[PDB]
Amino acid sequence: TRSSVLADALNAINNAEKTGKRQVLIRPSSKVIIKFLQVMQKHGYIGEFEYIDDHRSGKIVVQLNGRLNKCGVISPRFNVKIGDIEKWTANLLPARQFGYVILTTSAGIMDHEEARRKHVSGKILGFVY
């Protein structure tokens, strides 16, 4: 069974980080992929990344600095509440303040931090830590 492009990209990044490779080529690309990547990047887990347009789905190449422990796409798409968010983190992250759960809400894709600050909720996508 084939996997979603998001999952493939996540697995490639994890694999390369774990083998110590510093550059990863991801194909295909997508707005969900790219947005999740700047979320990582704002949290500093990844460095410079670059987009090839091939007049097709497209390609990414990501610089890795080795600070990524594990990143993953969670499924199925179950909804998450604002005031309740915390417990999912406690369930889906190794520790209290370590890691970031990613959630797609009415205001875009974002970690749960900017989420609770904006008092917005929506669908969970996955985790990075």
């Binding site: 796409v73 499924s75 199925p76």
Partner: peptide
């Protein structure tokens, strides 16, 4: 939830239990 190539899988019962 279980981990798979497609991604981490969470059961509906888990979603209700956590929720």
């Amino acid at each position: 939830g279980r981990s798979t190539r497609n991604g981490l899988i969470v059961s509906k019962r888990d979603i209700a239990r956590i929720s």
